[PDB]
């Protein structure tokens, strides 16, 4: 506690766009939170971005319209933005600023954390081990998510990246060969999708384990910047202090990046590559790397950032800077979507670098690693044979090629195509794999050792 009376200033040097420039301010802090009271009684929030002597410059979260330089008062809190955290906030829905929008009470805090936090000391970081199943076969039997990795979903605009994100929230959980929570943050989300997320989580009974943050497209753009920081601050409290595993999904990081560009312009910084700040790399790393396992504690944080690729070009700084500091990718395609396959996830360009540790005996099932590798090879070959068929015709194909075409058609229909309300656990996904693999005789399954085939292939 401070127990120091707050000072309220009516001294304003000027107002310039989102910024209010104050004067005669006593020992102002950078990043200090202040509150404005306008002549009409309207209250607004803001944060101090520059303190040059006694001339503090505050960015107002809401619009600055109506603010004068004669009557508007600015109350200083004497502190920075610290988020009230508790276990009870799980099952609540908040806006970007951390305020409830579910008609419940304000959070009754167990502590207050600086939302910027600190980096996790690498000496106590534990390499990811067990798996967190998502319920979606395309990313459980092919590119699983290790309990501690950070693997992004790249999608083009117009693809159902939000419907998959909602499906993960409803279906995701532990393998179960009560201590799992999901923290979901949507940045720049439009009103229709915000309703989708809120209602879909509530209706299906999943909300008890979800902490949902909605930052809407028409919400303050600076709030969009703290939104993922509040989500991660909560995740760190829940995961590392309360010994549980937290899955954090950051939806539309591209909209975050755009809000970050706006903040850079507010500071009158010279834009960097393609208009984005030169520090976009470290800012994304600051968000992404606040995850993983830690020594001596049983909690963990995973992340699934979801990013829209401008012009569907993976080269664009947003997916490029993300991918450079993340471990693999899920990759949602367009062709699969236009073919009315849901989920439209393309297994050939996707990768999960931690799959080697995620799966195997003691974590999922003995045959997990072998089934994944063989399915990948069979799908890649089936696509290759399909391309050949288009050139040589059906009569020019041999029996093995026809088997690969049968696999290709049934793989997409049975394995990839799922539906939004069918929850496939890791063991059912593998069993589906074997049903597709048993299309081929044993001698064609070159990537599965004979010991695995003899145990699993028959029956």
């Amino acid at each position: 506690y401070l127990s120091q009376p707050r000072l309220t200033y009516k001294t304003v040097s000027g107002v310039n766009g989102p910024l209010v420039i104050l004067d005669h301010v006593k020992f102002p802090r950078y990043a200090e939170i202040v509150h404005l009271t306008l002549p009409d009684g309207t209250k607004r929030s803001g944060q101090v971005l520059e303190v040059s002597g006694s001339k503090a410059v505050v960015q107002v979260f809401e619009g600055t319209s109506g603010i004068d330089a004669k009557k508007t008062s600015c109350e200083f809190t004497g502190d920075i933005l610290r988020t009230p955290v508790s276990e009870d906030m799980l099952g609540r829905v908040f806006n970007g600023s951390g305020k409830p929008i579910d008609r419940g009470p304000v959070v009754l805090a167990e502590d207050f954390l600086d939302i910027m936090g600190q980096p996790i000391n690498p000496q106590c970081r534990i390499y990811p081990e067990e798996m967190i199943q998502t319920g979606i076969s395309a990313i459980d039997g092919m590119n699983s998510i290790a309990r501690g990795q950070k693997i992004p979903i790249f999608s083009a605009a117009g693809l159902p990246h939000n419907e998959i994100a909602a499906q993960i929230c409803r279906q995701a959980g532990l393998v179960k060969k009560e201590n799992f929570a999901i923290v979901f943050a949507a940045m720049g989300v439009n009103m229709e999708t915000a309703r989708f997320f809120k209602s879909d989580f509530e209706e299906n009974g999943s909300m008890d384990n979800v902490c949902l943050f909605l930052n809407l497209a028409n919400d303050p753009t600076i709030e969009r910047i703290i939104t993922p920081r509040l989500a991660l601050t909560t995740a760190e409290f829940l995961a590392y202090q309360c010994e549980k595993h937290v899955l954090v999904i950051l939806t539309d990081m591209s909209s975050y990046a755009e809000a970050l560009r706006e903040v850079s312009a507010a500071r009158e910084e010279v834009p960097g590559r393609r208009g984005f700040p030169g520090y976009m790399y470290t800012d994304l790393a600051t968000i992404y790397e606040r995850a993983g396992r830690v020594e001596g504690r049983n909690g963990s944080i995973t992340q699934i950032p979801i990013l829209t690729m401008p012009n569907d070009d993976i080269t664009h700084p947003i997916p490029d800077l993300t991918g450079y500091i993340t471990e693999g990718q899920i990759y949602v395609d367009r062709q699969l979507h236009n073919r009315q396959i849901y989920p439209p996830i393309n297994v050939l360009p996707s990768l999960s670098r931690l799959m080697k540790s995620a799966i195997g005996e003691g974590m999922t099932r003995k045959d997990h690693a072998d089934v994944s590798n063989q399915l990948y090879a069979c799908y890649a070959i089936g696509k290759d044979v399909q391309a050949m068929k288009a050139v040589v015709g059906e009569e020019a194909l041999t029996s093995d090629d026809l088997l690969y075409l049968e696999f290709l058609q049934k793989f997409e229909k049975n394995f990839i195509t799922q539906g939004p309300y069918e929850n496939r656990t890791v063991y059912e996904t593998l069993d589906i794999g074997w049903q597709l693999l048993r299309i081929f005789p044993k001698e064609m399954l070159k990537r599965i050792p004979q010991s695995t085939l003899s145990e699993f292939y028959p029956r």
Partner: protein, 47 residues
């Protein structure tokens, strides 16, 4: 639906019982903290 309302009522009763046990002690500490002013000059004051 009755079991849900029944559990809710029981949880509220528990909170009401628990907070009563030390209600006066929490108020006493809070009043002490606000009553003790402890004036201080800003730490960066240099004169």
């Amino acid at each position: 639906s009755a079991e849900v309302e029944q559990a809710t009522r029981r949880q509220v009763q528990g909170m009401q019982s628990s907070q009563q046990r030390n209600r006066e002690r929490v108020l006493t500490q809070l009043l002490g903290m606000v009553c003790d002013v402890r004036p201080q000059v800003h730490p960066n004051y240099r004169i």
